[PDB]
Structure 1
Amino acid sequence: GSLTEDGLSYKEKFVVRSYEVGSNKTATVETIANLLQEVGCNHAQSVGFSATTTTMRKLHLIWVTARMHIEIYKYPAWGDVVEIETWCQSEGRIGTRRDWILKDSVTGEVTGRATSKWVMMNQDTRRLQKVSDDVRDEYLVFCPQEPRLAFPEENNRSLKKIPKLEDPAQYSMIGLKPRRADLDMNQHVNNVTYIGWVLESIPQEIVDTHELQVITLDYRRECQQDDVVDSLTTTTSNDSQFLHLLRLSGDGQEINRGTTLWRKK
């Protein structure tokens, strides 16, 4: 892939692999979310980050995901080439945003889009803090200065408040544990794995009759390597909608909440 002409965004093409497709013979939202994070990483490599700056590294500060929002119009087939464009933007002192457009290489049509909110956190104390002027400046030079939004709509689903699922849940999947393959290079659970855990409580019948269009996921707390998760789902609704909760099987400490929206095949 490559930065575009103006060096304010980055583009990469992926051929969908045999093991990346699910029950519809098209790419899983989990495969998609992995490609988003792959292109995100190549963008950061391309402008000399490692997504820490010099200042962040000095202060032991990291970016962490607060929210991910994916909307898929068409999942690419096995052997299809998908093109992904990604860019970042400062949201003043609150944090940063990374956005994504997925396109069919042949038709040039938008088959998906995604957006995500990052907040700055001390690596060691795990304490959140607003973005400091020095940090704001260092990456303002790699971002469009006029607003560029994957989700521009006046009241767009990407920014809606998600409520807490009350017990009892309609559906549950109990005793979920990450294996080593769920870990990134720094021994942290991959953000994508939590997508897998949320969807594990979706009943088979929905998987058989519907396709996932939208997923919104808040990240509250990270699941450690030796934590166990419970995944909870309740129907909230031609379109089916669900409310989602991931919590630790013991004390019921919340790690995630979400909504998914499915349309009849």
Structure 2
Amino acid sequence: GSLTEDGLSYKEKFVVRSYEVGSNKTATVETIANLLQEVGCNHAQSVGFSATTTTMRKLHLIWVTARMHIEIYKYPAWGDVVEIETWCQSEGRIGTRRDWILKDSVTGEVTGRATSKWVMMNQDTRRLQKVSDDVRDEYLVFCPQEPRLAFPEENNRSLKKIPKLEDPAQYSMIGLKPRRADLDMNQHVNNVTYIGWVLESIPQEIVDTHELQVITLDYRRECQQDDVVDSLTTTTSDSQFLHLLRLSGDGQEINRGTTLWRKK
């Protein structure tokens, strides 16, 4: 892994592992999402972070994911080498954005793209806030100044408003709980686990006959280590689904999302 020539983006190569692939011998969307997180972490490290800045540590502020959007054209096969390029951009005082481009290292063709929105939060009170002048200045020296979008298109899928699933759900997977492998180094549930939980309510027949093309996921509230989740799905249609993750007890919303699948 290394920063590019201008120092405004970062690239890394990965060889797809045996336990990282599903039934079609290609990487799962969760493996892709893990690789995106890893290259994001390596980018932050290369430019002097830890993604907390000096002003963020002084004010006890952290970046939290608000939205993740992934589009895959070809999932890499077991043993294939995939190259991922990542970069960050400031979005005024709303927050920041991290984008990714996935390419087949042998053919050089784009096989996937992703975009994520991050918001500022006080790590103690858990209260969201706007980006201060001081943080925006310390982030700009590591970001491209002109816009650089993984999803440039006017009215693309990554910025669509997602509705709340109405009961009864067509499909469901209940009593989902995180185990220690689902936690990050700070004992918080890893963001990729929520993608897995959303996908658990998709029926196996759809998975066996379709490929996941697009996934958009909103993050509303974190699942704690001792929480239990219900995963709900309804067909809205290619096949499209509307998703909802909520706490099994009180029914508190933790995530909402949509998936688009293509027939194999």
Q: Deviations over 1:142-178 (max 9, x none)?
A: 0000000000001100000000000000000000000
Q: Which residue in the other structure is 1:39 paired with?
A: 39
Structure 1 unaligned residues grouped into runs of 5+? none
Superposition RMSD on alpha carbons, in Å? 0.3
- TM-score if structure 1 supplies the norm length? 0.99
Q: Distance in 2 between matches of 1:65 and 1:51?
A: 12
Q: Which residue in the other structure is 2:15 paired with?
A: 15
> Tell me, what secondary structure is at the counterpart of 2:117?
strand
Q: Distance in 2 between matches of 1:23 and 1:163?
A: 31
Shift of 1:57: 0.2
Shift of 1:31: 0.3
Shift of 1:66: 0.1
Q: Distance in 1 between matches of 2:129 and 2:211?
A: 38
Q: Distance in 2 between matches of 1:24 and 1:202?
A: 17
Q: Which residue in the other structure is 1:259 paired with?
A: 258
- Alignment map for 1:137-216 (pairs within 5 Å): 137-216=137-216
Structure 1 stretches (4+) deviating beyond 4 angstroms? none
Q: Distance in 2 between matches of 1:147 and 1:183?
A: 34
Shift of 1:248: 0.3
> Tell me, what secondary structure is at the counterpart of 1:192?
helix
> Tell me, what secondary structure is at the counterpart of 2:22?
coil
Q: Deviations over 1:28-56 (max 9, x none)?
A: 00000000000000000000011100000
Q: Distance in 1 between matches of 2:119 and 2:33?
A: 19
Q: Distance in 1 between matches of 2:70 and 2:98?
A: 12
Q: State, as a whole percentage, how many aligned pairs show the same letter.
A: 100
Shift of 1:23: 1.3
> Tell me, what secondary structure is at the counterpart of 1:184?
coil
> Tell me, what secondary structure is at the counterpart of 1:126?
coil
Aligned length: 264
Shift of 1:208: 1.0
Q: Which residue in the other structure is 1:67 paired with?
A: 67
Structure 2 unaligned residues grouped into runs of 5+? none
Shift of 1:24: 1.2
Shift of 1:247: 0.1
Q: Distance in 2 between matches of 1:62 and 1:8?
A: 22
Shift of 1:202: 0.2
> Tell me, what secondary structure is at the counterpart of 2:52?
coil
> Tell me, what secondary structure is at the counterpart of 1:258?
strand
Q: Distance in 1 between matches of 2:216 and 2:245?
A: 13
Q: Distance in 1 between matches of 2:206 and 2:153?
A: 28
Q: Deviations over 1:243-263 (max 9, x none)?
A: 000000000000000000000
